[PDB]
Design a protein around this ligand. Structure first.
Ligand SMILES: *[C@@H]1O[C@H](CO)[C@@H](O[C@@H]2O[C@H](CO)[C@@H](O)[C@H](O)[C@H]2NC(C)=O)[C@H](O)[C@H]1NC(C)=O
Ligand SMILES: *[C@@H]1O[C@H](CO)[C@@H](O[C@@H]2O[C@H](CO)[C@@H](O)[C@H](O)[C@H]2NC(C)=O)[C@H](O)[C@H]1NC(C)=O
Ligand SMILES: *[C@@H]1O[C@H](CO)[C@@H](O[C@@H]2O[C@H](CO)[C@@H](O)[C@H](O)[C@H]2NC(C)=O)[C@H](O)[C@H]1NC(C)=O
Ligand SMILES: *[C@@H]1O[C@H](CO)[C@@H](O[C@@H]2O[C@H](CO)[C@@H](O)[C@H](O)[C@H]2NC(C)=O)[C@H](O)[C@H]1NC(C)=O
Ligand SMILES: *[C@@H]1O[C@H](CO)[C@@H](O[C@@H]2O[C@H](CO)[C@@H](O)[C@H](O)[C@H]2NC(C)=O)[C@H](O)[C@H]1NC(C)=O
Ligand SMILES: *[C@@H]1O[C@H](CO)[C@@H](O)[C@H](O)[C@H]1NC(C)=O
Ligand SMILES: *[C@@H]1O[C@H](CO)[C@@H](O)[C@H](O)[C@H]1NC(C)=O
Ligand SMILES: *[C@@H]1O[C@H](CO)[C@@H](O)[C@H](O)[C@H]1NC(C)=O
Ligand SMILES: *[C@@H]1O[C@H](CO)[C@@H](O)[C@H](O)[C@H]1NC(C)=O
Ligand SMILES: *[C@@H]1O[C@H](CO)[C@@H](O)[C@H](O)[C@H]1NC(C)=O
Ligand SMILES: *[C@@H]1O[C@H](CO)[C@@H](O)[C@H](O)[C@H]1NC(C)=O
Ligand SMILES: *[C@@H]1O[C@H](CO)[C@@H](O)[C@H](O)[C@H]1NC(C)=O
Ligand SMILES: *[C@@H]1O[C@H](CO)[C@@H](O)[C@H](O)[C@H]1NC(C)=O
Ligand SMILES: *[C@@H]1O[C@H](CO)[C@@H](O)[C@H](O)[C@H]1NC(C)=O
Ligand SMILES: *[C@@H]1O[C@H](CO)[C@@H](O)[C@H](O)[C@H]1NC(C)=O
Ligand SMILES: *[C@@H]1O[C@H](CO)[C@@H](O)[C@H](O)[C@H]1NC(C)=O
Ligand SMILES: *[C@@H]1O[C@H](CO)[C@@H](O)[C@H](O)[C@H]1NC(C)=O
Lengths: 433, 212, 419, 149
């Protein structure tokens, strides 16, 4: 009724859309990792490097609780690309890389994908498809001195960008003039490590700000940097929500026999979607399906004649139907359509709620592969192998003929459609009006 | 001394099991029927260019090839990848310094790590400063040139070491033969069998039939 | 440069005719599609696949998903209609007759084989050898199994052999098979004694032509190129529809659980709406291709159902409708996704030249042939049936008179005998 | 229930038009499916974004209806070409085509009009009351074989 948006259903077979509740439960699997990540140094050391020559660290093999940084909203900005910052304690990674430095507060703008400016050009480039976060805060009280903190440096000139996550240190005369400078400095021929005159009395935009960039490596290699998530027990052969190192799904986890090579971490379907996984604690290869899928189709007389109904589970065997619908987590009036004696194996799938019959009849409702069903005596839905019409046997022999002695003048109706309703649509009055 | 790769130099492109499928991918492969340089243990191990990435292979039964050096300039002035099988271990470091200078086993280094009857194939490439190593070992009995046939190299290692490598050299054992060739960006068609294993390929750019 | 064919000057004159002195029987084979694979698609399971977060966005698109599933259901039902209309033209299962004394004809290749597990004929079993799904997509079995189809082809065939036309028009009437062929010869304008005087020879030509069909079908699977297209096109379309799940459509991933795990709802909705838009357009493209392809297969099914009625259940007067040459008879054999007809036909085989004239003078009367043609061998005149040389003396019964000698162009003089 | 074909040709066009109307209520990701809401709540620079979702969805819905009507119109024309043929061959003639002008041997046919369609009353001879007989292909008299005319 809900599939057809109707209170009446005519005689036939119908492919029901799924309205079942199947409320499910959750399972979580993660590495046994306990080393706390060194964020309390990276965000807190006495100085960070020059923006010409920024600091870098690969982080691996640790518990990354970002909630300290998420609660420390004293950071002037904490902006993420390709990840919402809320997810960082539930998601996890193969590698993380932290880059850090100090820069003028106005000029922090440059540290994002798609930016331009002399630092974005010459000495720090993110890829424009960067996945990760930039964090920055005012550091005037620490990083301003003399009106002359000329350690915090940027390229005055040279040519071409520094490429995404390249480093450069190089110390040369840059040859801005038409002159063959060729080692000799002068006007338009100059060394290039120019830098900020940070006074502690500088106006807001003229002050130094501290910066950290986090880049996250979401590869299909093994995870190593992971949030404060706790693994559950591993349930098998039930519909569960599931999560492996942040790789989520909902479906049936099972044991499996997929012959992974030692480095192969996941198995994939034709759709290029994960369908098997290695447990990060157990090292067992598990298989995945959605929640025990099978095509539910309903065989019915008209609701005008009975509310009694039968179900065909397309593409499953009668041994597995209760585990298909998950009878453990379903309405009792629905649950009756597992087991129940009137359960029969067609070639198309398991049929439940139909009384099988050894006779053959003309096909009332079609089920598939020669099986049909009808409503009959005290009434029930019955299912049977269909009739091909009566057998007959012509009395052929080499010298015998049959000739008709009489006739009947039939009148046979035939009906054909010839035309259909002419229409037109005023597109502007339909679309806009 | 030139010769040719024919059909060698395939490797597993990513860390995923796929079965009974004709998957297709673009990567730095050794092209089908590409030329390669032959060498044997004399003087035959000068410094060579690394380009986008190296296919390297050696035909041996006693490990005469022992290792490799890679860098910009291999000079005691900037970081150079050192790799050495020392029989007890496989040994890896990034030093500038020629603290041992010898191009063979005698018959500020930000990273270090330690683990003609045989053909050892090795592939070296570097993406965004992530160096990647692949290999295959197979028994053989063979002519002076690479075996025309098929096998796929598994990854051994990924190293995040970031060096601007442009040059390399190989380390021997002194008081056997080897081959060198280069990777190109190519689109390949790959045949994964029932057992998660690559069994054949096509280099689409090779000829009009391969495009077909 | 391709050649259109060998060149030929027809040896025309105002008075020359060529008449065939002999014939040959042939058994040309014709193949048609009837029903493509019954697919069906659970469009929410394809588009979202077991995510509540995506399904509540797909509801914002309204009835697109249901009218697509309805359209596919209409295609899936009409595959059984096609198969019904082509094979179920006989109201009864006539079983195979016990004793096979069909005057020398040998149908054992095309009648069912009791030793086959599904009781296909021998040729139906060759045809079944020469011809060679997961993400919310499904495939459904046909309503009639290949064994039920083999019962219908057996019934049509056993009726055709034992009773001719008659089982189409009324109840089947038994008739001896050498009489049925004599009436089918008479239907192509060849006098029925031309069968009886040649019965064993005719049967040997039929049996030999049946033999050549086993060889022909055994030589290459490319003989079934029409039916192998029906399979390949539908497999290719499903692989295309599945592999589109790997496409980005401008979202940050083609794998929905990436977005759902990495992004909050207000950010994720912008990505997921691209995937919903892209997947929905990709599913609309598949269903539109299947609707257009279903009409092509249905046009083929109606043409097969027409050859079934007009050529199996009868004899066809319609030029080249059922095999080349003059049509005698046809036998259906089943095949995967289709049907095959063995069209039995008569072809004239040994031309000879004769002189001819449209009418004959006698007593100043002009005589015209009652049936057939006037011809001469150079010394005598005869009348013959048009399609097989059978010279008869010209007489007052095998002629009729009109007018007198003056009117007809090209008339000639010859004495008509009176019995 | 006998006129199922013609009744279905009526029902499909009502079903198509009701579907085309109902899609006007769908949001397609806009803040409302009723266009005056967008125009009254939002200033033009922002309203334009929401209106373009409604235009995109409604236009995609209307192209789907016209594509479906083009395909269905060809299906009706294929039936009109057959009816035009039965009119010329069965009514204006007598047909030798087995089972074209109804079951049995054809005699005659009469057209009758109907909504969206046509109905033929095919008159046909069907044989009845068989007898068995012995039979032979030819007869011998004076040693000549005689065959029946
Ligand atoms: C690899 O070495 C080259 C020089 O051999 C370096 O080239 C400079 O790159 C910067 C950007 O970082 C450009 O602005 C300069 O124009 C380049 N120099 C010259 C002479 O043009 C390069 O930095 C190194 N790359 C990596 C990835 O380490
Ligand atoms: C008519 O044509 C058939 C062949 O189509 C001729 O039959 C062959 O006759 C020769 C002897 O002359 C036999 O060796 C062959 O085996 C026959 N063929 C078959 C298929 O049986 C027949 O002789 C021709 N008749 C005339 C009058 O020319
Ligand atoms: C009818 O034709 C079949 C073949 O289509 C004949 O059967 C074969 O006959 C040969 C000898 O001529 C035997 O070696 C084979 O074993 C037979 N095969 C089968 C399946 O029986 C058959 O002899 C012919 N029968 C008649 C009565 O003409
Ligand atoms: C034209 O046909 C006639 C009749 O068949 C042929 O005449 C007969 O020829 C045979 C020998 O072939 C004679 O024994 C008969 O006595 C002839 N009968 C008559 C009525 O003449 C005639 O030979 C044929 N002509 C040609 C040129 O073939
Ligand atoms: C057919 O026979 C008739 C006679 O029965 C021929 O007619 C005569 O032909 C000559 C020459 O043309 C005329 O002079 C006579 O006047 C004709 N007689 C009559 C009664 O018409 C006729 O020529 C013959 N035709 C052929 C082709 O031989
Ligand atoms: C993982 O941790 C559990 C306790 O939480 C322990 O019982 C189990 O042995 C560990 N497994 C591995 C492989 O570390
Ligand atoms: C930085 O260090 C101080 C103590 O020196 C501590 O109170 C503070 O919480 C630290 N902040 C972070 C982000 O680790
Ligand atoms: C359907 O129900 C109506 C009353 O609602 C009744 O008149 C009619 O006879 C019923 N028809 C069938 C087929 O049950
Ligand atoms: C049905 O499934 C059971 C296992 O659950 C299996 O033993 C049996 O062979 C299956 N039967 C068919 C007809 O597939
Ligand atoms: C149906 O037939 C089978 C044997 O073919 C028999 O086992 C079964 O009991 C029969 N059932 C009925 C209701 O006759
Ligand atoms: C390989 O090298 C030789 C010279 O050593 C050269 O002539 C040949 O053209 C090269 N092969 C190809 C495929 O070009
Ligand atoms: C370390 O290596 C760099 C080049 O990467 C070099 O400039 C620097 O001088 C080296 N420092 C020492 C202490 O060797
Ligand atoms: C090989 O190298 C490792 C350290 O890299 C060392 O422990 C081992 O003793 C070495 N073996 C030899 C034979 O030098
Ligand atoms: C797959 O591996 C099994 C052994 O686990 C072996 O029996 C089978 O032959 C292999 N198949 C292929 C195609 O290598
Ligand atoms: C008929 O006779 C003419 C005589 O010139 C000849 O050219 C032609 O080929 C002959 N045709 C047949 C069918 O014998
Ligand atoms: C036929 O052609 C010849 C010349 O080739 C001519 O003399 C004769 O009159 C023609 N006869 C007819 C009936 O046209
Ligand atoms: C014709 O004769 C046979 C003789 O066995 C008999 O079986 C058959 O029933 C008869 N058929 C009719 C229609 O009289």
């Amino acid at each position: 009724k809900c599939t057809l948006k109707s209170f009446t259903v005519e005689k036939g077979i119908y492919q029901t859309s799924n309205f079942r509740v199947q409320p499910t439960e959750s399972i979580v699997r993660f590495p046994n990792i306990t080393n706390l990540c060194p964020f309390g140094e990276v965000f807190n050391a006495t100085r960070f490097a020059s923006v010409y020559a920024w600091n870098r660290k690969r982080i691996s093999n640790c518990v990354a609780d970002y909630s300290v940084l998420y609660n420390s909203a004293s950071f002037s900005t904490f902006k993420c690309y390709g990840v919402s910052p809320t997810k960082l304690n539930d998601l996890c990674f193969t590698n993380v890389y932290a880059d850090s430095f100090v820069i003028r507060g106005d000029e922090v703008r440059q540290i994002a994908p798609g930016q331009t400016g002399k630092i974005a050009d010459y000495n720090y480039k993110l890829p424009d498809d960067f996945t990760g976060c930039v964090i920055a805060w005012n550091s005037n009280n620490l990083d301003s001195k003399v009106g002359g903190n000329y350690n915090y440096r940027y390229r005055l000139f040279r040519k071409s960008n520094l490429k995404p996550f390249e480093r450069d240190i190089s110390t040369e005369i840059y040859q801005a003039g038409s002159k063959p400078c060729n080692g000799v400095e002068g006007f338009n021929c100059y060394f290039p490590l120019q830098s900020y005159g940070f006074q502690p009395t500088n106006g807001v935009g003229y002050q130094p700000y501290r910066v950290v960039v986090l880049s996250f490596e979401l590869l299909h290699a093994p995870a190593t940097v992971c949030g404060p998530k706790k693994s559950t027990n591993l349930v098998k052969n039930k519909c569960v929500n599931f999560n492996f190192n942040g790789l989520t799904g909902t479906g049936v986890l099972t044991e499996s026999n997929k012959k992974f090579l030692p480095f192969q971490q996941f198995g994939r379907d034709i759709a290029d979607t994960t369908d098997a996984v290695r447990d990060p604690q157990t090292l067992e290869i598990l298989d995945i399906t959605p929640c025990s899928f099978g095509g539910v189709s309903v065989i019915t007389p008209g609701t005008n004649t009975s509310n009694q109904v039968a179900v065909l589970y397309q593409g499953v065997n009668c041994t597995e139907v209760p585990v298909a619908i998950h009878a453990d987590q379903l309405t009792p009036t629905w649950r009756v359509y597992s087991t129940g004696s009137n359960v029969f194996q067609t070639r198309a799938g398991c049929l439940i709620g139909a009384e099988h019959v050894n006779n053959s009849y003309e096909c009332d409702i079609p089920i598939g592969a020669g099986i049909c069903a009808s409503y009959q005596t005290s009434q029930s839905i019955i299912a049977y192998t269909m009739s091909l019409g009566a057998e007959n046997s012509v009395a052929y022999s080499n010298n015998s003929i049959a000739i008709p002695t009489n006739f009947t003048i039939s009148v046979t109706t035939e009906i054909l459609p010839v035309s259909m309703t002419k229409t037109s649509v005023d597109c502007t009055m339909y679309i806009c009006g | 001394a030139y010769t040719n790769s024919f059909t060698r130099g395939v490797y597993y492109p990513d860390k995923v099991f796929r079965s009974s499928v004709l998957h297709s991918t673009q990567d730095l492969f050794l092209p089908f029927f590409s030329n390669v340089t032959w060498f044997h243990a004399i003087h035959d191990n000068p410094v060579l260019p690394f380009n986008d990435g190296v296919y390297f292979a050696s035909t041996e039964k006693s490990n005469i090839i022992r290792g490799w050096i890679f860098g910009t300039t291999l000079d005691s002035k900037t970081q150079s990848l050192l790799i050495v099988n020392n029989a007890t271990n496989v040994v890896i470091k990034v030093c500038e310094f020629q603290f041992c200078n010898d191009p063979f086993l005698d018959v500020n280094c930000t990273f270090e790590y330690v683990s003609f009857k045989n053909l050892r194939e090795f592939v070296f490439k570097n993406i965004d400063g992530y160096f990647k190593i692949y290999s295959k070992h197979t028994p053989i009995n063979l002519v002076r040139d690479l075996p025309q046939g098929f096998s796929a190299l598994e990854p051994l290692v990924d190293l995040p070491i970031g060096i601007n490598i442009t040059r390399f050299q190989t380390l021997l054992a002194l008081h056997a033969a080897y081959y060198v060739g280069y990777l190109q960006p190519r689109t390949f068609l790959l045949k994964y069998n029932e057992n998660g294993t690559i069994t054949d390929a096509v280099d689409c750019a090779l000829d009009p039939l391969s495009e077909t | 440069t391709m050649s259109l064919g060998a060149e030929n000057s027809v040896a025309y004159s105002n008075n020359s005719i060529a008449i065939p002195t002999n014939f040959t029987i042939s058994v040309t084979t014709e193949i048609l599609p009837v029903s493509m694979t019954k697919t069906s698609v659970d469009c929410t399971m394809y588009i979202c696949g077991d995510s509540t977060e995506c399904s509540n966005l797909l509801l914002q698109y309204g009835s697109f998903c249901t009218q697509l599933n309805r359209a596919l259901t209409g295609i899936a039902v009409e595959q059984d209609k096609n198969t019904q209309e082509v094979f179920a033209q006989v109201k009864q299962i006539y079983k195979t007759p016990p004793i096979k004394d069909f005057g020398g004809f040998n149908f054992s290749q095309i009648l069912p084989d009791p030793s086959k597990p599904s009781k296909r004929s021998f040729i139906e079993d060759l045809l079944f050898n020469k011809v060679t799904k997961f993400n919310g997509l499904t495939v459904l079995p046909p309503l009639l199994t290949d064994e039920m189809i083999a019962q219908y082809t057996s019934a049509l065939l056993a009726g055709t052999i034992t009773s001719g036309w008659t089982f189409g028009a009324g109840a089947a009437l038994q008739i001896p098979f050498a009489m049925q062929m004599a009436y089918r010869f008479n239907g192509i304008g060849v006098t029925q004694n031309v069968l009886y005087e040649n019965q064993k020879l005719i049967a040997n030509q039929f049996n030999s032509a049946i033999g050549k069909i086993q060889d022909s079908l055994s030589s290459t699977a490319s003989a079934l190129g029409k039916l192998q297209n029906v399979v390949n096109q539908n497999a290719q379309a499903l692989n295309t529809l599945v592999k589109q799940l790997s496409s980005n459509f401008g979202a940050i991933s083609s794998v929905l659980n990436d977005i759902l795990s990495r992004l909050d709802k207000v950010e994720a909705e912008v990505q997921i709406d691209r995937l919903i838009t892209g997947r929905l357009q990709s599913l609309q493209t598949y269903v539109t291709q299947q609707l257009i392809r279903a009409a092509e297969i249905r046009a083929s099914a109606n043409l097969a159902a027409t050859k079934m009625s007009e050529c199996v259940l009868g004899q066809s007067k319609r030029v080249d409708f059922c095999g080349k040459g003059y049509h005698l008879m046809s036998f259906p054999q089943s095949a995967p996704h289709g049907v095959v007809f063995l069209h039995v036909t008569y072809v004239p085989a040994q031309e000879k030249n004769f002189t001819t004239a449209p009418a004959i003078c006698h007593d100043g009367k002009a005589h015209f042939p009652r049936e057939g043609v006037f011809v001469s061998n150079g010394t005598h005149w005869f009348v013959t049936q048009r399609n097989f040389y059978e010279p008869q003396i010209i007489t007052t019964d095998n002629t009729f008179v009109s007018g007198n000698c003056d009117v007809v162009i090209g008339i000639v003089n010859n004495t008509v005998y009176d019995p």
